[PDB]
UniProtKB/Swiss-Prot annotation, chain A:
The lineage of its organism: Eukaryota, Metazoa, Chordata, Craniata, Vertebrata. It comes from Homo sapiens (Human). Transmembrane segments: none annotated. SUPFAM superfamilies: N-terminal nucleophile aminohydrolases (Ntn hydrolases). The gene is PSMA7. CDD domains: proteasome_alpha_type_7. This is Proteasome subunit alpha type-7. Keywords: Acetylation, Cytoplasm, Glycoprotein, Host-virus interaction, Nucleus, Phosphoprotein, Proteasome. The keyword Phosphoprotein applies. It comes from the Eukaryota.
Swiss-Prot record, chain D:
It comes from Homo sapiens. It is found in: Cytoplasm. The modification N6-acetyllysine is found at K92. GO terms for biological process: osteoblast differentiation; positive regulation of proteasomal protein catabolic process; proteasome-mediated ubiquitin-dependent protein catabolic process; ubiquitin-dependent protein catabolic process. GO terms for molecular function: ATP binding; ATP hydrolysis activity; proteasome-activating activity. Monoubiquitinated by RNF181. Phosphorylated. Dephosphorylated by UBLCP1 which impairs PSMC2 ATPase activity and disrupts 26S proteasome assembly. This is 26S proteasome regulatory subunit 7. Coiled coil: none annotated. PROSITE patterns: AAA. Induction: Expression is not cell cycle-dependent and occurs throughout the cell cycle.
UniProtKB/Swiss-Prot annotation, chain F:
The modification Phosphoserine is found at S108. The gene is PSMC3. This is 26S proteasome regulatory subunit 6A. It is linked to Deafness, cataract, impaired intellectual development, and polyneuropathy: An autosomal recessive disease characterized by early onset of deafness, cataract, severe developmental delay, and severely impaired intellectual development. Patients later develop polyneuropathy of the lower extremities, associated with depigmentation of the hair in that area. Component of the 26S proteasome, a multiprotein complex involved in the ATP-dependent degradation of ubiquitinated proteins. This complex plays a key role in the maintenance of protein homeostasis by removing misfolded or damaged proteins, which could impair cellular functions, and by removing proteins whose functions are no longer required. Therefore, the proteasome participates in numerous cellular processes, including cell cycle progression, apoptosis, or DNA damage repair. Belongs to the AAA ATPase family. It is found in: Cytoplasm; Nucleus. Component of the 19S proteasome regulatory particle complex. The 26S proteasome consists of a 20S core particle (CP) and two 19S regulatory subunits (RP). The regulatory particle is made of a lid composed of 9 subunits, a base containing 6 ATPases including PSMC3 and few additional components. Interacts with PAAF1.
Curated annotation (Swiss-Prot), chain G:
The modification Phosphoserine is found at S18. This is 26S proteasome regulatory subunit 8. Component of the 26S proteasome, a multiprotein complex involved in the ATP-dependent degradation of ubiquitinated proteins. This complex plays a key role in the maintenance of protein homeostasis by removing misfolded or damaged proteins, which could impair cellular functions, and by removing proteins whose functions are no longer required. Therefore, the proteasome participates in numerous cellular processes, including cell cycle progression, apoptosis, or DNA damage repair. The gene is PSMC5. ATP binds at G88, P89, P90, G91, T92, G93, K94, T95. Signal peptide: none annotated.
Length: 239, 248, 51, 401, 398, 171, 101
């Protein structure tokens, strides 16, 4: 009877509404993010959009700033609002301080907005967990995960959404310094990690690749096709 | 239960009120829109066809938002009217600040943001209005957009919302030729879909409303088909059905 | 309704046009019909009869 | 377009296929079932044991002599004596009779209210009988001390001390209470979360009760016939009064002590009302300390819970950290565990878990140590058991830190 | 003592397929059956003292012999026995009755005329309880379950291993878990794991429904539960299986109804027998529920139900195992690639991974084929998976 | 019915007799096969009450914790009519109860029974006696020869199973 | 009467004098369960049911084929379907098909 109000503590000190909100993140398309020496990758699964609908308006990977991009899970309605507020915050931070918004700062602001929305009644928590990754450190790659609760964390490689447990288990046992020593191997690692969660053909994986002092490069289906062909060749070599 | 208010999250993480609204959107009358290579169109069903009801506006379900946009409606009447007024206000505000037509998706996103804000802040019931958007912009041209009570929109080539939306959408998927539909063919397909989307046989012209978006000499004329052309299309569909049954 | 206690769930949709005609014939067998009692027209007048 | 099967199709389906051995195997199976049934029928006895003594024990031809000479006597109670004196005898339920004694018995032997035997023909009183001692009520006694002592109950020092002050101290040392003019509480209601250890404390008290301990079976008190449960409660309390310093344990008192409502339980409510006046009211109960236990105290009638019948209400709360550590040591005394097991960590990893869950964790650790053929259960086994027993029944823990 | 009355079962035949090796095995079993039949048929016929004693005892006893309750023992040759009609009789105890068994509450056997005690009824078990005892063990063994390995291991450690290898538990010092609850979606393998345990187990197996424990009369419920557990204890190694526990194990709540309060009393008697005053003995309780959140916390607390075994909907490997198990008898074709149906979304249970098999067989029969094909399996899946209506959200989440 | 009639006849035989039917709810439940026998027992009592010649030498006193469950016919006019009401003891009532049940025990003259009465709101007489007995027992725990007011307060805490601890936020 | 034919709960008849069993008698059936056994067959016939040929065949696949020819299922290696459920709009013919069966 303690799960009907955000600001009500359960006898064991649980804010049950936030835990329920995380369940919303548990129901979204998987997002995998791994950062390399000179590359940050945001893996995503496409949901095989309807035969008669356009996929241009189903963008799940969006860039908050010119060099910071985020991939979210959970309900799209809240994710869009969070993304818009993050963009406005980045453009305001640039305005007040000319230095471009750091990935840490944008993640902190997203967490602050989520916490403010999960602090009092009459305001439902944001049911989207955002993986904010960017080279905004001016020579250092960073990746962050903003839980629907409001806490963020620095992750070398983390998974959100459906299958997050399996993708995280794969990433832990395969993400080594030898793995991400080059951009191509980092992209291959992202593809391999997302393959176990999303069993399907091409166009079911959208990869956002960002290099140092560059712009977001949403890889075309062919390039993902080339990388999957390479991974299949590697598997054939192993056998 | 976990549907006392919109703000409440179910243990599985579902906005029960939002789902209830998106289910209730089915009570609304059938409306559909097919995107054609030369334009897009909308089709709606007048549920109220009483003889004592005087048709004064002719656009109960299809509203003009801007000089290059129009959006059909489906859902509560008061919510639909508020949403259409807000759409007009947003479009004209964008025109005043930027002095160019809203690129359609901007208006759709603004309305979806308003609906999301309603579904988030406590003390407000979700807008139970799902309305199809049509229009042309310099960036992508003709587009058809679907808006749900939850603020989740999406580009679509042909969709139907309201009564028997599932059957209409499925059989539009079955017989929609991508990139090969002209406005005449689009109207023919829309009439074919509306014929069996509603239980009423013979698809009375007074009981169906069709509006078409065309790009003529850079004007974007929105035309609501008069009863004469609607009757002509109905007769054409009847003759086509007779020809098809000829094989029998 | 588990597939071990109930194996086959046969649906019973409201009879279609031919089904309505067949039902009319079944229930009109003992009736004294008159020439020009076309039952297809009567069935067409029942769009969704419960059966 | 589906087409039904015909006779020829069925015949070909059952023939066009495997028929070289199928028929033989099927017939063999049917006839094997038949043979099993035939064997079972042929034996089909399993002679039921009867109380027949060893042949030398009875070996009596005078048993017929006693059967022919001795005559069965109906048992009845003499309600009144009339003054040759006449006696009114109630033959339980048969009828009321006015009979006179046979020459065998003397008039002085038979007193009013005594249950005496009578012949089945004339109803004359032939012999007196000892007063009824109910068999169910008598079996309700313990007469066999359970092997759980107070040392096996951990984390409840205050609760155990209160229980002893209620049921044991007043019986062993009445002087400490008589000198200061203190009437010790006569009842204790052990209410707490299920599996916390109320029944264990009751068993310990019965173990060192050094008096009459009566375990009240909730089934017997609820009887099929109307008024039987109240009679059973009244017989139990009389049997407690006849003894000195008896102890009654009303285990799961919520079984019968539900809140009265307006047929509903009705009869169970009447039995509850009988226990209530027995515990408190006219005719002081006497030296009968009542022990009641229940995991759901809120459903008890307020009359039964008033501090006149259940004087001391001991709350068996979930053990604190020290209680959990002591419980872990108590339940791990026999387990072949390693010497470095940090029981403090295992206690801290079971935040809100009763003693029963601690025992379950200990048994799970032992079972894990048995899975891999290891005769010593290391602390990792206990950690896995804790995960399986408490945690089993990350993103949520992500927020906390 | 009255050791286990284990259910009888014939040995298992391995070939399954109608090969001549199976014929030889069945012929050998039949030969031994005819062997036993002939031996026991000749024994009495081929057969040609105690007769005098038996005749004397039966002539003293006479017939019919009434069954009454012994109320008290006054002397060594006298007792008060209350006939079934409630009337107490001061009858004489005859010599040929072992005085050791004569205890208050026992069912005494009395002469019809003089009512003199002539014997003590030993079993006198409630007929509604003796029915529960499993005599013919079900044929479903462990090999008949696809997967559910962890669950099989837990159930074996709880009910099977302790009897066979009690050394491990005795040395470790831990009493083996004496209570297991099987909970999970419907059609997962709960009753199956119970049938397999009953088949393999050598201890007396008692089956209950959770609805037969409730009796119309007031006190019949708790007394029936007590009789069931007493019968289980009489046969020292026993397993009691209370399927559909959620019938009487619903959360206790203040009920203004004797029906509900009677059901609650039955549950209380059950939980008192399971873990309360006096040890439970060597009786293990297995319970099944497709709803564990609605059970009284006391009934499913550690001590009574020591292993809350979970039975999830089958995963890919488990689903492939249940297709192999339920299609082994079937004569599959060459193109039957079960993986297509095995994929599924998330919601294929054993019942379905069997009804699907039955429907594929029936559709093969429709086309007059005894060898199924891939199209048959796809059609059977489409026909038999129609269980849930929506059970899903809309296109909100991304 | 026979038992009730015999009891009333015995009350008649003795001239100055009083019958105390305690826990009248057992047989006084509202009219609704044991129900039949109990309804018959009730009728007998309602009759033996109306069988009395007015102002006879036998008076019946009944007790009950629930008048709602009681059958309305029992009250009536010629039957039990003097519905003597017993209220939960007031402040003075609780203080007097504590004084009466603390008489036999060695009690400190420093006890402020009025403060205890204030601190024991919603306490019936039985609970007040339990409070006194618990205070005595607690005093015995510490080996104190004579009771103290704090002992009475701790007994009041114990009577309702409550436990008082030094909370970390109430300083 | 042989002792092997008296199975538990057989409702035997006993002689009044010596209480000897001299008959087995039909097994006791609760009065109320007897009325549920269809002794008089209903008049509905399959030809009276129209528009449900597929439904009739599907139901007969479970109510007729498994019992009429269990050998087909034994050879196929599939378990005999046990139950069938009829569901649809009211007055569609479910009870009519039940009567026909
Ligand atoms: N405090 C404890 N210390 C040690 N062992 C305990 C404790 N509590 C429970 N146990 C263990 O759990 C077993 C069962 O617990 P017990 O029956 O005493 O619980 P309960 O609270 O009386 O149950 P319920 O409230 O359901 O009647 C005990 O025999 C003992 O082995
Ligand atoms: N895992 C499985 N492996 C093999 N056969 C299975 C499995 N699950 C189900 N089956 C088959 O389907 C039947 C249904 O499963 P089962 O009887 O165990 O259901 P249950 O879990 O008891 O469900 P309910 O809640 O309906 O009682 C089994 O008897 C068996 O024939
Ligand atoms: N397909 C059909 N063929 C013949 N008669 C039908 C059909 N459907 C409905 N009916 C008629 O409608 C009536 C409905 O009776 P019933 O079978 O009880 O309906 P339901 O199954 O909905 O309860 C029947 O008397 C039957 O004669
Ligand atoms: Mg207990
Ligand atoms: Mg089951
Ligand atoms: Mg019907």
């Amino acid at each position: 009877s303690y799960d009907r109000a955000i600001t009500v503590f359960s006898p064991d000190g649980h804010l049950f509404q936030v835990e329920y909100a995380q369940e919303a993140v548990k129901k979204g398309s998987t997002a995998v993010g791994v950062r390399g020496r000179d590359i940050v990758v945001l893996g995503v699964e496409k949901k095989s959009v309807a035969k008669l609908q356009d996929e241009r308006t189903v963008r799940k990977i969006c860039a908050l700033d010119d060099n910071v991009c985020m991939a979210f899970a959970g309900l799209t309605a809240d994710a869009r609002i969070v993304i818009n507020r993050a963009r406005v915050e980045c453009q305001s931070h640039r305005l007040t301080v000319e230095d471009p918004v750091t990935v840490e700062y944008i993640t902190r602001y997203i967490a602050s907005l989520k916490q403010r929305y999960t602090q009092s009644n009459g305001r439902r928590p944001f049911g989207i967990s955002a993986l904010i990754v960017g080279f905004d450190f001016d020579g250092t790659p960073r990746l962050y995960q903003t839980d629907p609760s409001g806490t963020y964390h620095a992750w070398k490689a983390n998974a959100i959404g459906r299958g997050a447990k399996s993708v995280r288990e794969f990433l832990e046992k395969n993400y080594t310094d030898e793995a991400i020593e080059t951009d191509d191997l980092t992209i291959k690692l992202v593809i391999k990690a997302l393959l176990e969660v999303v069993q399907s053909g091409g166009k079911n994986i959208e990869l956002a690749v960002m290099r140092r002092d560059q712009s977001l490069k949403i890889l075309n289906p062919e390039e993902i096709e080339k990388y999957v062909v390479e991974i299949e060749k590697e598997k054939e070599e192993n056998e | 239960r976990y549907d006392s208010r919109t703000t409440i999250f179910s243990p599985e993480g579902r906005l029960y009120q939002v789902e209830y609204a998106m289910e209730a959107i089915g009570h609304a009358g059938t409306c559909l829109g097919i995107l054609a290579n030369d334009g897009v169109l909308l089709a709606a069903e007048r549920r109220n066809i009483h003889k004592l009801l005087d048709e004064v506006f002719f656009s109960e379900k299809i509203y003009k938002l801007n000089e290059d946009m129009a959006c059909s409606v489906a859902g509560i009447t008061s919510d639909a009217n508020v949403l259409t007024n807000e759409l007009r206000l947003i479009a004209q505000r964008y025109l005043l600040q930027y002095q160019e037509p809203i690129p359609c998706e901007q208006l759709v996103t603004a309305l979806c943001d308003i609906k999301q804000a309603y579904t988030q802040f406590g003390g407000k019931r979700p807008f139970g209005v799902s309305l199809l958007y049509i229009g042309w912009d310099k960036h992508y041209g003709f587009q058809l957009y679907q808006s749900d009570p939850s603020g989740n929109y999406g580009g679509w080539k042909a969709t139907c919302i309201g009564n028997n939306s599932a059957a209409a959408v499925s059989m539009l998927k079955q017989d929609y030729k991508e990139g090969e539909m002209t406005l005449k063919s689009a109207l023919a397909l829309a009439i074919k879909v509306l014929n069996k989307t509603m239980d009423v046989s013979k698809l009375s012209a007074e009981k169906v409303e069709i509006a078409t978006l065309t790009r003529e000499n850079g004007k974007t004329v929105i035309r609501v088909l008069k009863q004469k052309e609607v009757e002509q299309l109905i007769k054409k569909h009847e003759e086509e059905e007779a020809k098809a049954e000829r094989e029998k | 309704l588990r597939p071990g206690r109930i194996d086959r769930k046969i649906e019973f949709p409201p009879p279609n046009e031919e089904a309505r005609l067949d039902i009319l014939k079944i229930h009109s067998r003992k009736m004294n019909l008159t020439r020009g009692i076309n039952l297809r027209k009567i069935a067409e007048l029942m769009p969704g009869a419960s059966g | 377009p589906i087409r039904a099967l015909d006779e020829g199709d069925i015949a070909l389906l059952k023939t066009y296929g495997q028929s070289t051995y199928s028929r033989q195997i099927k017939q063999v199976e049917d006839d094997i079932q038949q043979l099993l049934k035939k064997i079972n029928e042929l034996t089909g006895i399993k002679e039921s044991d009867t109380g027949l003594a060893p042949p030398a024990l009875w070996d009596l031809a005078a048993d017929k002599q006693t059967l022919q000479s001795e005559q069965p006597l109906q048992v009845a109670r003499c309600t009144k004596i009339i003054n040759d004196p006449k006696y009114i005898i109630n033959v339980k339920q048969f009828a009321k009779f006015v009979v006179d004694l046979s020459d065998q018995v003397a008039p002085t032997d038979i007193e009013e209210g005594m249950r005496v035997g009578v012949d089945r023909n004339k109803y004359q009183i032939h012999i007196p009988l000892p007063p009824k001692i109910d068999p169910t009520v008598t079996m309700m006694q313990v007469e066999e001390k359970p092997d759980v002592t107070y040392s096996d109950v951990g984390g409840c020092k205050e609760q155990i001390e209160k229980l002893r002050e209620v049921v044991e101290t007043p019986l062993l040392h009445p002087e400490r209470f008589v000198n200061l003019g203190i009437e010790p509480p006569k009842g204790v209601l052990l209410f707490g979360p299920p599996g916390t250890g109320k029944t264990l404390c009751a068993r310990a008290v019965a173990n060192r009760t050094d008096a009459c301990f009566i375990r009240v079976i909730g089934s017997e008190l609820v009887q099929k016939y109307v008024g039987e449960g109240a009679r059973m409660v009244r017989e139990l309390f009389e049997m407690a009064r006849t003894k000195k310093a008896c102890l009654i344990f009303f285990d799961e008192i919520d079984a019968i002590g539900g809140a009265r409502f307006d047929g509903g339980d009705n009869e169970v409510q009447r039995t509850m009302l009988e226990l209530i006046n027995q515990l408190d009211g006219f005719d002081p109960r006497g030296n009968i300390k009542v022990l009641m236990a229940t995991n759901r105290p809120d459903t008890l009638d307020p009359a039964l819970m008033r501090p006149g019948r259940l004087d001391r209400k001991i709350e068996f709360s979930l053990p604190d950290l020290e209680g959990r550590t002591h419980i872990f040591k108590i339940h791990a005394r026999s387990m072949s565990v390693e010497r470095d097991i940090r029981f403090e960590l295992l206690a801290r990893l079971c935040p809100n878990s009763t003693g029963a869950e601690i025992r379950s964790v200990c048994t799970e650790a032992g079972m894990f140590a048995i899975r891999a053929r290891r005769k010593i259960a290391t602390e990792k086994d206990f950690l896995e058991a804790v995960n399986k027993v408490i945690k089993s029944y990350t993103p949520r823990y992500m927020t906390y830190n | 003592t009255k050791g286990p009355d284990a259910a009888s079962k014939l040995p298992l035949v391995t070939p399954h397929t109608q090969c001549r090796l199976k014929l030889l095995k069945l012929e050998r079993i039949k030969d031994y059956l005819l062997m036993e039949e002939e031996f026991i048929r000749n024994q009495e016929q081929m057969k040609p003292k105690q007769e005098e004693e038996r005749s004397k005892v039966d002539d003293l006893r006479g017939t019919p012999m009434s069954v009454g309750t012994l109320e008290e023992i006054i002397d060594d040759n006298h007792a008060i026995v209350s006939t079934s009609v409630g009337s107490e009789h001061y009858v004489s105890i005859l010599s040929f009755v072992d005085k050791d068994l004569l205890e208050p509450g026992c069912s005494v056997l009395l002469n019809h005329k003089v009512h003199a005690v002539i014997g003590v009824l030993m079993d006198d078990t409630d007929p509604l309880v003796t029915v529960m005892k499993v005599e013919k063990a079900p044929q479903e063994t462990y090999a008949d379950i696809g997967g559910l390995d962890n669950q099989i291991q837990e159930i074996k450690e709880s009910v099977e291993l302790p009897l066979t290898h009690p050394e491990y538990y005795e040395e470790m010092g831990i009493k083996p878990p004496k209570g297991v609850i099987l909970y999970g979606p419907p059609g997962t393998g709960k009753t199956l794991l119970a049938k397999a345990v009953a088949n393999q187990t050598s201890a007396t197996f008692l089956r209950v429904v959770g609805s037969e424990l409730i009796q119309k009369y007031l006190g019949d419920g708790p007394k029936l539960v007590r009789e069931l557990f007493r019968v289980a204890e009489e046969h020292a190694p026993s397993i009691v299986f209370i399927d559909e526990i959620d019938a009487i194990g619903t959360k206790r709540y203040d009920s203004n109804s004797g029906g509900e309060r009677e059901i609650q009393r039955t549950m209380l008697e059950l939980l008192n027998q399971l873990d309360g005053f006096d040890s439970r003995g060597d009786v293990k309780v297995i319970m099944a529920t497709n709803r564990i959140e609605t059970l009284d916390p006391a009934l499913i607390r550690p001590g009574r139900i020591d292993r809350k075994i979970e039975f999830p909907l089958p995963d890919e490997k488990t689903k492939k195992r249940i297709f192999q198990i339920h299609t082994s008898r079937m004569t599959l074709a060459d193109d039957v690639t079960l993986d297509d149906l095995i994929m599924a979304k998330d919601d294929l249970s054993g019942a379905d991974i069997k009804a699907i098999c039955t429907e594929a067989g029936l559709m093969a029969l429709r086309e007059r084929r005894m060898k199924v094909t891939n199209e048959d399996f796809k059609k059977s899946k489409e026909n038999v998976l129609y269980k849930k209506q929506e059970g899903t959200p809309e296109g909100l989440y991304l | 019915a026979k038992l009730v009639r015999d009891a009333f006849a015995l009350a008649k035989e003795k001239a100055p007799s009083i019958i105390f039917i305690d826990e009248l709810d057992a047989i006084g439940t509202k009219r609704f096969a044991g129900d039949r026998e109990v309804q018959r027992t009730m009728l007998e009592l309602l009759n033996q009450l109306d069988g009395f010649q007015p102002n006879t030498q036998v008076k019946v006193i009944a007790a009950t914790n629930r008048v709602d469950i009681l059958d309305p016919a029992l009250l009536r006019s010629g039957r039990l009519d003097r519905k003597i009401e017993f209220p939960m003891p007031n402040e003075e009532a609780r203080a007097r109860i504590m004084q009466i049940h603390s008489r036999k025990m060695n009690v400190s003259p420093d006890v402020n029974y009025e403060e205890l009465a204030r601190c024991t709101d919603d306490f019936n007489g039985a609970q007040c006696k339990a409070v006194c007995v618990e205070a005595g027992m607690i005093a015995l725990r510490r080996g104190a020869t004579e009771l103290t007011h704090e002992d009475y307060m701790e007994g009041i805490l114990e009577v309702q199973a409550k436990k008082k601890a030094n909370l970390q936020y109430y300083a | 009467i042989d002792i092997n034919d008296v199975t538990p709960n057989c409702r035997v008849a006993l002689r009044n004098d010596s209480y000897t069993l001299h008959k087995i008698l039909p097994n006791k059936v609760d009065p109320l369960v007897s009325l549920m056994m269809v002794e008089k067959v209903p008049d509905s016939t399959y030809e009276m049911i129209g528009g449900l040929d597929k439904q009739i065949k599907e139901i007969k696949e479970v109510i007729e084929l498994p019992v009429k020819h269990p050998e087909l299922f034994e050879a196929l290696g599939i378990a005999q379907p046990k139950g069938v459920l009829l569901y649809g709009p009211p007055g569609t013919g479910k009870t009519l098909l039940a009567r026909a069966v």
